[PDB]
Amino acid sequence: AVGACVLCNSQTSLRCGACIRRPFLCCKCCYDHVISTSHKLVLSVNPYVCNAPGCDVTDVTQLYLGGMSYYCKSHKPPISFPLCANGQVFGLYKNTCVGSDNVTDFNAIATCDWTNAGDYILANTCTERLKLFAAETLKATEETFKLSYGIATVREVLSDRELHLSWEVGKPRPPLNRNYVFTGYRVTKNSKVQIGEYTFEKGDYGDAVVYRGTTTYKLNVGDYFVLTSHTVMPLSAPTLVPQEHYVRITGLYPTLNISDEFSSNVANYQKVGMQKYSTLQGPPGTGKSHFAIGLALYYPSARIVYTACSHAAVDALCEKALKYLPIDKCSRIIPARARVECFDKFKVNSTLEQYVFCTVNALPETTADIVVFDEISMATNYDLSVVNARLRAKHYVYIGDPAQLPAPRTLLTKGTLEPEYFNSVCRLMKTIGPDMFLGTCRRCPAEIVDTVSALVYDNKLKAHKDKSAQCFKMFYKGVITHDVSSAINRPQIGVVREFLTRNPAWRKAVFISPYNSQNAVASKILGLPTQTVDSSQGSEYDYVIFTQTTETAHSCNVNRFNVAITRAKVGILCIMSDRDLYDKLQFTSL
Amino acid sequence: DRDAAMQRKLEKMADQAMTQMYKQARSEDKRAKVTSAMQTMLFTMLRKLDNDALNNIINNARDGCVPLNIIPLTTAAKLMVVIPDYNTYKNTCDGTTFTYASALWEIQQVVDADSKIVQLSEISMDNSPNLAWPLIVTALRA
Amino acid sequence: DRDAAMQRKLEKMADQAMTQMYKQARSEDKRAKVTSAMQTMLFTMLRKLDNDALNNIINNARDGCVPLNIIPLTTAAKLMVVIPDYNTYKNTCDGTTFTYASALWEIQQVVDADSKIVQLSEISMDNSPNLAWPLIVTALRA
Amino acid sequence: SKMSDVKCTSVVLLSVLQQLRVESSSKLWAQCVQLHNDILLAKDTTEAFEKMVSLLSVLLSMQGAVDINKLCEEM
Amino acid sequence: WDLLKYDFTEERLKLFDRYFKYWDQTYHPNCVNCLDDRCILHCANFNVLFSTVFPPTSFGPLVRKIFVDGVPFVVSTGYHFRELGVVHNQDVNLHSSRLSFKELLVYAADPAMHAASGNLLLDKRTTCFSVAALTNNVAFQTVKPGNFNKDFYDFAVSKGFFKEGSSVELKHFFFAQDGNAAISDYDYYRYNLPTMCDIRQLLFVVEVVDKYFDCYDGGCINANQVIVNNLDKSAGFPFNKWGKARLYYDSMSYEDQDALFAYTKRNVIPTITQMNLKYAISAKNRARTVAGVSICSTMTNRQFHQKLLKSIAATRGATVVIGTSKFYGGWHNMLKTVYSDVENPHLMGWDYPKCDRAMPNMLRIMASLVLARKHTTCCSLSHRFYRLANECAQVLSEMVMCGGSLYVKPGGTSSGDATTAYANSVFNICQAVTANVNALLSTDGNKIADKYVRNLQHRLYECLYRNRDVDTDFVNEFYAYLRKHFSMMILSDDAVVCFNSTYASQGLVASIKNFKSVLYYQNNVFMSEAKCWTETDLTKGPHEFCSQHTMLVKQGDDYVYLPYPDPSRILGAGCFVDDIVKTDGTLMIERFVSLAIDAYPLTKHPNQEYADVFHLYLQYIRKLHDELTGHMLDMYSVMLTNDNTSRYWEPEFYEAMYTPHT
Numbered sequence A: 001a002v003g004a005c006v007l008c009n010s011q012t013s014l015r016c017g018a019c020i021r022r023p024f025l026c027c028k029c030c031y032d033h034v035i036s037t038s039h040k041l042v043l044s045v046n047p048y049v050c051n052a053p054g055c056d057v058t059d060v061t062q063l064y065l066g067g068m069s070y071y072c073k074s075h076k077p078p079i080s081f082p083l084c085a086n087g088q089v090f091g092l093y094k095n096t097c098v099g100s101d102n103v104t105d106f107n108a109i110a111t112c113d114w115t116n117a118g119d120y121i122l123a124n125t126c127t128e129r130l131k132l133f134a135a136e137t138l139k140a141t142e143e144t145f146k147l148s149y150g151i152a153t154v155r156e157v158l159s160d161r162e163l164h165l166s167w168e169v170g171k172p173r174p175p176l177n178r179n180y181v182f183t184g185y186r187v188t189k190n191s192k193v194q195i196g197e198y199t200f201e202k203g204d205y206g207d208a209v210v211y212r213g214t215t216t217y218k219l220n221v222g223d224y225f226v227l228t229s230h231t232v233m234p235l236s237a238p239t240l241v242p243q244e245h246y247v248r249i250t251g252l253y254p255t256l257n258i259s260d261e262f263s264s265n266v267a268n269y270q271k272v273g274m275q276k277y278s279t280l281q282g283p284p285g286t287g288k289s290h291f292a293i294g295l296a297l298y299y300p301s302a303r304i305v306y307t308a309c310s311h312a313a314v315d316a317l318c319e320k321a322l323k324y325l326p327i328d329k330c331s332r333i334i335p336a337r338a339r340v341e342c343f344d345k346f347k348v349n350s351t352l353e354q355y356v357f358c359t360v361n362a363l364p365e366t367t368a369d370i371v372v373f374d375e376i377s378m379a380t381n382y383d384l385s386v387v388n389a390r391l392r393a394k395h396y397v398y399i400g401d402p403a404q405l406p407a408p409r410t411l412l413t414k415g416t417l418e419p420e421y422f423n424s425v426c427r428l429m430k431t432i433g434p435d436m437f438l439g440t441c442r443r444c445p446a447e448i449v450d451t452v453s454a455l456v457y458d459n460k461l462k463a464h465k466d467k468s469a470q471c472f473k474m475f476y477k478g479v480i481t482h483d484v485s486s487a488i489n490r491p492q493i494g495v496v497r498e499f500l501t502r503n504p505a506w507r508k509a510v511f512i513s514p515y516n517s518q519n520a521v522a523s524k525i526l527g528l529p530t531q532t533v534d535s536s537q538g539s540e541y542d543y544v545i546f547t548q549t550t551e552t553a554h555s556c557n558v559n560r561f562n563v564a565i566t567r568a569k570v571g572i573l574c575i576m577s578d579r580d581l582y583d584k585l586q587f588t589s590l
Numbered sequence B, C: 001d002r003d004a005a006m007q008r009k010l011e012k013m014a015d016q017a018m019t020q021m022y023k024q025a026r027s028e029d030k031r032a033k034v035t036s037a038m039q040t041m042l043f044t045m046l047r048k049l050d051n052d053a054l055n056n057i058i059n060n061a062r063d064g065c066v067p068l069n070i071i072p073l074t075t076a077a078k079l080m081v082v083i084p085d086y087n088t089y090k091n092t093c094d095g096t097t098f099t100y101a102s103a104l105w106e107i108q109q110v111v112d113a114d115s116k117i118v119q120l121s122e123i124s125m126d127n128s129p130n131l132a133w134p135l136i137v138t139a140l141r142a
Numbered sequence D: 001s002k003m004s005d006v007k008c009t010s011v012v013l014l015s016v017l018q019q020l021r022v023e024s025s026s027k028l029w030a031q032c033v034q035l036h037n038d039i040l041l042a043k044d045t046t047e048a049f050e051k052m053v054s055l056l057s058v059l060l061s062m063q064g065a066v067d068i069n070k071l072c073e074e075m
Numbered sequence E: 001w002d003l004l005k006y007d008f009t010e011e012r013l014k015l016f017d018r019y020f021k022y023w024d025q026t027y028h029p030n031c032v033n034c035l036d037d038r039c040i041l042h043c044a045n046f047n048v049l050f051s052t053v054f055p056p057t058s059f060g061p062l063v064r065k066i067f068v069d070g071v072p073f074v075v076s077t078g079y080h081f082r083e084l085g086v087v088h089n090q091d092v093n094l095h096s097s098r099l100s101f102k103e104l105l106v107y108a109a110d111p112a113m114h115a116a117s118g119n120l121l122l123d124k125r126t127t128c129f130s131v132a133a134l135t136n137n138v139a140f141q142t143v144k145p146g147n148f149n150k151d152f153y154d155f156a157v158s159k160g161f162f163k164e165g166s167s168v169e170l171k172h173f174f175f176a177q178d179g180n181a182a183i184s185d186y187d188y189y190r191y192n193l194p195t196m197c198d199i200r201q202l203l204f205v206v207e208v209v210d211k212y213f214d215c216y217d218g219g220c221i222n223a224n225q226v227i228v229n230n231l232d233k234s235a236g237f238p239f240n241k242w243g244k245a246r247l248y249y250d251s252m253s254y255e256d257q258d259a260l261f262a263y264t265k266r267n268v269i270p271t272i273t274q275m276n277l278k279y280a281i282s283a284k285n286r287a288r289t290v291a292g293v294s295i296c297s298t299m300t301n302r303q304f305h306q307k308l309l310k311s312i313a314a315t316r317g318a319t320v321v322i323g324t325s326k327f328y329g330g331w332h333n334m335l336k337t338v339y340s341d342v343e344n345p346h347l348m349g350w351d352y353p354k355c356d357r358a359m360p361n362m363l364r365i366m367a368s369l370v371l372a373r374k375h376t377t378c379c380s381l382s383h384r385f386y387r388l389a390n391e392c393a394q395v396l397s398e399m400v401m402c403g404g405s406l407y408v409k410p411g412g413t414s415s416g417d418a419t420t421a422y423a424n425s426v427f428n429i430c431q432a433v434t435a436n437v438n439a440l441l442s443t444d445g446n447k448i449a450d451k452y453v454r455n456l457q458h459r460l461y462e463c464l465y466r467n468r469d470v471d472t473d474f475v476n477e478f479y480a481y482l483r484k485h486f487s488m489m490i491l492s493d494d495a496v497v498c499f500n501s502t503y504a505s506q507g508l509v510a511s512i513k514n515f516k517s518v519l520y521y522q523n524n525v526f527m528s529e530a531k532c533w534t535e536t537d538l539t540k541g542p543h544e545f546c547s548q549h550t551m552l553v554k555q556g557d558d559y560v561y562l563p564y565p566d567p568s569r570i571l572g573a574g575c576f577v578d579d580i581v582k583t584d585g586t587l588m589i590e591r592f593v594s595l596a597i598d599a600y601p602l603t604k605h606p607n608q609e610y611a612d613v614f615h616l617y618l619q620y621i622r623k624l625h626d627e628l629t630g631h632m633l634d635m636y637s638v639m640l641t642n643d644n645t646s647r648y649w650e651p652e653f654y655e656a657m658y659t660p661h662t
């Protein structure tokens, strides 16, 4: 099979071997990649190993081609020529080839391990194709490292159509994916070598699995299968569609006297109208999730697909459309997994309707007329590429605020990421500014919003409310037991145990904590509805019991504190341990 | 002479290798492109015809004036096409007549997205924004 | 040289016999699979049989032999009429019950050529052009 | 060469319509193949041309299966 | 009538004794009791009319509830033919224990299982009898249009082709069809009426046809001698669900293949045949259909007929030209074997309208009997009768599958069985001999100038309607007369005849009107003159044989006949391919080389733009090779050391194709 080079888009057939995603690579580009980095394996239509009965020389600059096979220096034929000569690697389309200087960033992209915080910076300023490749290999490396695998061995061979499986107890097990691979690990003495590449789909009877392998060797008794490497889908669409500026309204049909609430944003609906993609930035609780419904009721005859990376944002959008949009044809899309509960009050799973509600990983391959991507703060470049490849519409709407939380990025454990480096849309809205804006708080009271209007924003955000003076600030140890590598604080839930009996107006409160373990154990202790900082973004909460547990770089960030505190529409109790963060808040001091 | 002849055999065995190689690659090279690529062929070769009816029709399709059903060919048969702009109405509909596909049509419907029965006179310069765009026409062929 | 030249053709014939035996083994393994598939098909069609009416009509026979064309005519529990136009619909299965093959059938379902459900009130004289003929009505013995 | 030129355009247009699964709608596919077989058996320039217009109108009514704007600026 | 009644022997005897009471020949309602192959035809002729008063639901296979392994099957233990009467299987196993592959094959091939299991069907789209529908929804199958080769068409129009005022424009296209194609084409079997042929004349045309088929030899062959041309072809229903025919020729050894073949010689196996829509180029818009016979009938029919079928295809200079090439001067040899002792030559060729769907069942049974007259040593009489019954149960009138639904075939040949070209050739020779006999008898007699041929007509009448045994001397004399005055050349429906012009003008050999009358009263179709030609000049050959026009050219020092095809057909084949991989061109040079081979004789045609097609294809091959070499120079760095294509674009390779040396 042939393909296109990454950094020059020329026709080629030389895959690199030691790159994590197994991409297609050029001739001169591959020469520069394997002559400067530690990657030495290259996959042509046949692998570039030596063809001696016993020999392992997989480096390409090192072999010779004689006859029709690849031979080493010791096993070279009298008539041959080395593969890596004249600055290129031997492959198809030899002199129809052009190179570039994108290898200086390509080498660093393919060489890094994505635990640093500078490679993430590099993955967002270079050209578009290298951006896509960097995101793809980010997802691949994440799937390799985090939640890796459990060791599995085969007890006996029943047949070549159905296999036997035995998971090692003590570690979990990844399920079927043809995208997943279990590399053969007969590791004993005795050929600790790749014996093939396998995936496993299970049967409905007995202890059997009907596998799919890519090798023609029978299994040994000691052969193992531990999941190393994963193949994600090679998306093609760019992160952002190129901008085109319009003069009059195209593809959309405005309404006169639309309503009373959306009358302030009518000029906003035009400026959404005559641009290809428009961006909205605003502090939380200002109406970003309301502007989508405003667009819907300003452009009534056009289909709009409403989609977000998570389910909570699309469900809050469901709620707002439920109160403002016609109930009769509105939609909601759930995946075939159906793992979690969704907003099942419209038509569930009707892709042909005018208002489609969905989540980025489960969109159908259909058209649209306006697309409104909600909360790009949850969006990476992968999700943007997904929505660009699957949804094909005249207008794109990107609404969100970088001051709220970025994507999890569980590999990121060192350094700090700026809001403008979360994705491409954040880089747009923080560098050249958002197209249009609102800042005015109608959600949290004047006290707590005045606190947060110095930490993340420096006094550009006022409020229209009172200082209700139940933002209680408490400072205690909260002895931390480190059980599940997720923080549990029994004395913190204890001071909260006995500060709920004194407050009769806080029996409807909601428990918030940046650690999922203590978060979950708080259910039986005190019985309040219980949510984490990550999943509570979007919905409005009357009373909030926020409980900061530990002192670290994980729970002491101002951003997650911002979203956890700003969801209390009338009052909040905050538990704490820090002293730089306590020095700047304006709360009741206890 | 011996190794010269067996060298013949090596290059011809490579002829299998190369000819199989090219045929199989170009096989689903021809498969992967063709659908969108032969849509492009259809449009290039359609454009080569240069018939004013097809030109008029697909230049109206570009602006959004696409028909909602097949265009009938017998005299006095129903066609319904959506009007996306006042300029598009101004160019094609004059009086109660409707020129389209280089043919003459007279109006039965003008009707909007509200499905409200609408009559012919109010579509004018200063009354055009008052309309619920886009409008759907029903016409017969004269 | 003579002995080695003899052994070369020996290797050729050994490979040929090896290939023939390998092909024969694969043929045997395919024969077993097709035998299993045929057995399963036959036994499932046996499970589909309506044994009571079949036993009745076979016991009514003299030799035990009956024509095949009357087995569904007297034992099939579900009937399908394929209807090309509206007049034949009005002539053969008008209403919700009709009489064919000296029995009474009730219409449980009506589907068009696109396998879409058509309600029985949709089939009218004026509404015939809007239906994707032919219509496949499905009826059960009563 | 104006006459042997339409008769191939009908073939490619019907192939494109079959590509976009008009075949799953028996009613529409009826006059699609009807117009195709009638244009193949045509004698004058005219009826070939407005039967061409009628057959292309099937592709015209299709909002999302085609996107009309890409396939006609670069050509 | 009673539904369960299938034995109408008493009713047939009562009808015979009421109407044909003094017809003194013996009549057996069930043809299993017949004396020989001349008694099968006679009783079948009486039955084909006597079966038109009985209900159509009483025919078809005779099922019977058997029990295997304690589980109740329902299988066909016989057939009630409309022509051969009631036939019972000699080997029924009511209590079986183990089912071998032969038993699975038999019990899966027959329609008793599927029709018994399936739902009842009432199809108003056709007048043919409908039995059952297996699946719960009727399947509609369409035909895609062809795929345009724009490169070839652009190259053609850049060479001065496809204008107005052109004698060569595209006329063969790939016509598409809607979902009502297969069902509306199977409805054409309504043209097949139950036809009672004249029996005292058919029993002599049979002798004449057998004399035409006397040079060849045939018989039964073992399973290790049957050779198949292609193993990847389909195996009918229900065997297409599990694989192609290769699976059933590899899974079954020779022993259980001979066991099945010997089982069919004393048993009847009813068989389902699919109807497959063809995806091919044609000049008219109607859908053409071919009947896919399953493997259970095909293997046994091959073992029965292949010796004779491959003996016919290996003899040169005979009446039935099957196996004779049109290349290497084979067309010239056939066309000069046509002109063997004709007095005042004139050329004639007719056309059968709806040839494969309007044939009466009697003529097909006759063709199957004439093809089975070589088994006078290998087979007994009951074996031959049961083989004929199997042929009628698997070919002539059996259940037909049309889009997941089982119907009943009223008759005529299914055009996909093992013996279709040869049986059709027998049918064509029969129609020609019947036309000759009708022309000779219908002549006045007092106007007869030759005094011998008046005596020949007298003896013809007395051997038709006054004799009951064969008169081999007069049969030889009449066959010699026919080969002397009515020389023929048959390939299965196309005949070129070099009949005597003087005798035809006097009316002593068959003419066009005689064939029209014969097709009217023995085929139930009308033969119009509009598509049947007559050539009065022998120097230009027949007007059209096998869709190839022929003409006289000069090669070397003598003159030969070269068949040239319709250039519209060749240009349509080049322009309209049926696949995407055939559109690119550079992958397939064999397509255009074969087309240039087929269209080479156009260069010798007097009309210039007829001749320009060969040069168009040649320059196209030249450009195709040039751009293929360019592409393989861009996608590698090495240019092919032995690029052997140099002879494909110069006319020696195609000129040597029509020279009689090889």
Ligand SMILES: Nc1ncnc2c1ncn2[C@@H]1O[C@H](COP(=O)(O)OP(=O)(O)O)[C@@H](O)[C@H]1O
Pocket: A261, A262, A264, A282, A283, A284, A285, A286, A287, A288, A289, A290, A291, A442, A538
């Ligand atoms: N112009 C307005 N007038 C009255 N209420 C408004 C207006 N705009 C927004 N709101 C209210 O403020 C809330 C904003 O919610 P949301 O859209 O989630 O804010 P954001 O998206 O900025 O976080 C809505 O529930 C809505 O009821």
Ligand SMILES: [Mg+2]
Pocket: A285, A287, A288, A289, A290, A538
């Ligand atoms: Mg919001």
Ligand SMILES: [Zn+2]
Pocket: A016, A017, A018, A019, A033, A039, A040, A110
């Ligand atoms: Zn690498």
Ligand SMILES: [Zn+2]
Pocket: A005, A006, A007, A008, A009, A010, A025, A026, A027, A028, A029, A030, A098, A099
């Ligand atoms: Zn490159």
Ligand SMILES: [Zn+2]
Pocket: A050, A051, A052, A054, A055, A056, A057, A071, A072, A073, A074, A075
């Ligand atoms: Zn080596």
Ligand SMILES: [Zn+2]
Pocket: E026, E027, E028, E031, E033, E034, E035, E039, E040, E043
């Ligand atoms: Zn008899």
Ligand SMILES: [Zn+2]
Pocket: E219, E220, E304, E375, E378, E379
């Ligand atoms: Zn025999």
